[PDB]
Ligand binder design. Structure first.
Ligand SMILES: [Zn+2]
Ligand SMILES: [Zn+2]
Ligand SMILES: [Zn+2]
Ligand SMILES: [Zn+2]
Ligand SMILES: [Zn+2]
Ligand SMILES: [Zn+2]
Ligand SMILES: [Zn+2]
Ligand SMILES: [Zn+2]
Lengths: 73, 305
């Protein structure tokens, strides 16, 4: 119900549809389902804040079209 | 018009605009929630599950309010929302800006003890200059942010969407720098290859960093942490005006009669929904406008300061 972008520091963008009530862990699963990166190697950062897997996108007040940064561990 | 609320319209406006407060049931997400009481502060409309109500939607168990904001400058879609920028306020007291000293509106008011005020033009300048100078602060909890211009303690901006005032491209730049700073704070490193700038989290054991990742995630360059050159062998060398600040303070620069029965009513926090405690009148009115309570007053100034 909400489109967001997942962006590497390299500038590769991955468009993903999410529910604002979805947990950050569910976001990582969607990244796996289309880029094949295992969630355990994914670090999501929003506006400099490392995101909590048990928190929701709505907790960060992320709106449609906004960007989460992905870093590989 | 009195506007209590300002949003960042990412839509056609591409700027800070006066906003409209709306409320729905948090369960069915319909406009079917009759609030127990009106909101009186920012906390009431920003923190989930703080205010209660009765949902009128058939067989809905919801008793919780979900508030949202829309830009009030443009004809909105039903689904769209804009982020509320709580630091911003109409400058009704005609306070001067900390930077340009001019009287402007709206203004951003920092949450420092001095409640320093700055115009949106000067706030933009502050943000742009600080972003270039790598002077943004990385907080392990609050993210990538700035305090009050004057450097007041406990003034770091918490609602990071305030930085949208940078504009779309500069905001993206702000978010890239935030992630970059976050990586460095996590003990990681940035790939030094021009056109890459990948965020890599190696161990302090392995100082053999390979830019791992395919289909545009990594470049494959192998580098040494110290020099930021190709993997080496072993160890190889190879200003705020004082008077302007003083004047730019929100605060340092009770009851009201019923419009029908002139009997004094006391305000309930910041809520502008007033009900007269006089049985023969009991008028429902707006503290600000002095008209009968309506949906326009709700959207524009349900509560204030
Ligand atoms: Zn707008
Ligand atoms: Zn409902
Ligand atoms: Zn100014
Ligand atoms: Zn201050
Ligand atoms: Zn690289
Ligand atoms: Zn070296
Ligand atoms: Zn009355
Ligand atoms: Zn009113």
């Amino acid at each position: 119900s909400m489109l967001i972008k997942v962006k590497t520091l390299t500038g590769k963008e991955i468009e993903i549809d999410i529910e604002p009530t979805d947990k950050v862990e569910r976001i990582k699963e969607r990244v796996e389902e289309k880029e094949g990166i295992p969630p355990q190697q994914q670090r999501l950062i929003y506006s400099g804040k490392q995101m909590n897997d048990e928190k929701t996108a709505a907790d960060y007040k992320i709106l449609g079209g906004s960007v989460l940064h992905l870093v590989l561990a | 018009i009195y506007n209590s609320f300002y949003v960042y319209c990412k839509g056609p406006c591409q700027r800070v605009q006066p906003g409209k407060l709306r409320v729905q049931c948090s369960t069915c997400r319909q406009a079917t929630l009759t609030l127990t009481q009106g909101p009186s502060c920012w906390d009431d409309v920003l923190i989930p599950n703080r205010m209660s109500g009765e949902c009128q939607s058939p067989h809905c168990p919801g008793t919780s309010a979900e508030f949202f904001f829309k830009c009030g400058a443009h004809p909105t879609s039903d689904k769209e929302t804009s982020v509320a920028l709580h630091l911003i306020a109409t400058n009704s007291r005609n306070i001067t800006c900390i930077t340009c000293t001019d009287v402007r509106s709206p203004v951003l008011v920092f949450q420092c003890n001095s409640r320093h005020v700055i115009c949106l033009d000067c706030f933009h300048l502050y943000c742009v200059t600080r972003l270039n100078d790598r002077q943004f602060v990385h907080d392990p909890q609050l993210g990538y942010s700035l305090p009050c211009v004057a450097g007041c303690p406990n003034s770091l901006i918490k609602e990071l969407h305030h930085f949208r005032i940078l504009g779309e491209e500069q905001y993206n730049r702000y978010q890239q720098y935030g992630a970059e700073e976050c990586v460095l704070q996590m003990g990681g490193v940035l790939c030094p290859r021009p056109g890459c700038g990948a965020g890599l989290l190696p161990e302090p054991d392995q100082r053999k960093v390979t830019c791992e990742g395919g289909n545009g995630l990594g470049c494959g360059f192998a580098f040494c942490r110290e020099c930021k050159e190709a993997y080496h062998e072993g160890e190889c060398s190879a200003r705020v005006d004082e008077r302007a600040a003083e004047q730019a303070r929100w605060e340092a620069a009770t009851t009201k009669p019923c419009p029908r029965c002139h009997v004094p009513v006391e305000k309930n926090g910041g809520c502008m929904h007033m009900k007269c405690p006089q049985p023969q009148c009991r008028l429902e009115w707006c503290w600000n406008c002095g008209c009968e309570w309506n949906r326009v007053c709700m959207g524009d100034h349900w509560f204030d300061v």
